[PDB]
Design a protein around this ligand. Structure first.
Ligand SMILES: [NH3+][C@H]1C[C@@H]1c1ccccc1
Ligand SMILES: [Ca+2]
Length: 223
């Protein structure tokens, strides 16, 4: 996250870190046994790390649970990033409390102008690199559809939204991939892609989760 603030330990209780020997993607806990992330985060051998603030220090609220199954969306296209969403089932159910909690799925899509919280452990610089060890937060609005398609001509599908600032300086960034965009207590977006980070007129692009709610529900009811 570029131009954000330190969230505070366990203040984003649904945030997960996907680990394959190192943090490589964020994700969101949607119930005690399922995590949703970005399909471009797919990897074999994922351990899900819950209750994290400092991902390099065991601080006492962590739950490390290995993945038993991963399901990439059936129409994921890695060239266009259309339908960049994946579900991960945990080998055992997470123990839920004030610091480890699931986030609600939306019943309605969020409108442009809605303020949202984006969070993750990714790069905090738009120019060069510096990775935080503690969780970073960013409040950003959902941008209008037409400003989103104007910033990314011929690249925005109906399964994407832009969120952020056309002026730049505040954005999600590499390593924030798969992480949550929560608006009014509901998961609305997944950190998906963008042109660099925090660049002028190149806002972050997010997977529009409200389009996938029935595939998610159907899939966890059957797996
Ligand atoms: N414009 C930056 C939000 C987009 C981003 C870049 C790389 C990884 C995740 C998100
Ligand atoms: Ca830790």
């Amino acid at each position: 996250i570029v131009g954000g603030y330190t969230c505070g330990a366990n203040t984003v209780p649904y945030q997960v870190s996907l680990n394959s020997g190192y943090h490589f993607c964020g994700g969101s806990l949607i119930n005690s046994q399922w995590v949703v992330s970005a399909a471009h985060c797919y990897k074999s051998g994922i351990q899900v790390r819950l209750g994290e603030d400092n991902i390099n220090v065991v601080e006492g609220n962590e739950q490390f649970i290995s993945a038993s199954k991963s399901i990439v969306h059936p129409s994921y296209n890695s060239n266009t990033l259309n339908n960049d969403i994946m579900l991960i089932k945990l080998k055992s159910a997470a123990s839920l409390n004030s610091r480890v909690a699931s986030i609600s799925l939306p019943t309605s899509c969020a409108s442009a102008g809605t303020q949202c919280l984006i969070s993750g452990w990714g790069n905090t610089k738009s120019s060069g690199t510096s990775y935080p060890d503690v969780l970073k937060c960013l409040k950003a609005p959902i941008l209008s559809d037409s400003s989103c398609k104007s910033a990314y001509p011929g690249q925005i599908t109906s399964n994407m939204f832009c969120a952020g600032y056309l002026e730049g300086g505040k954005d999600s960034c590499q390593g924030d991939s798969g992480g949550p965009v929560v608006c009014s207590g509901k998961l609305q977006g997944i950190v998906s892609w963008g042109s660099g980070c925090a660049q002028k007129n190149k806002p972050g692009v997010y997977t529009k989760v409200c389009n996938y709610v029935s595939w998610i529900k159907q899939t966890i009811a059957s797996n």
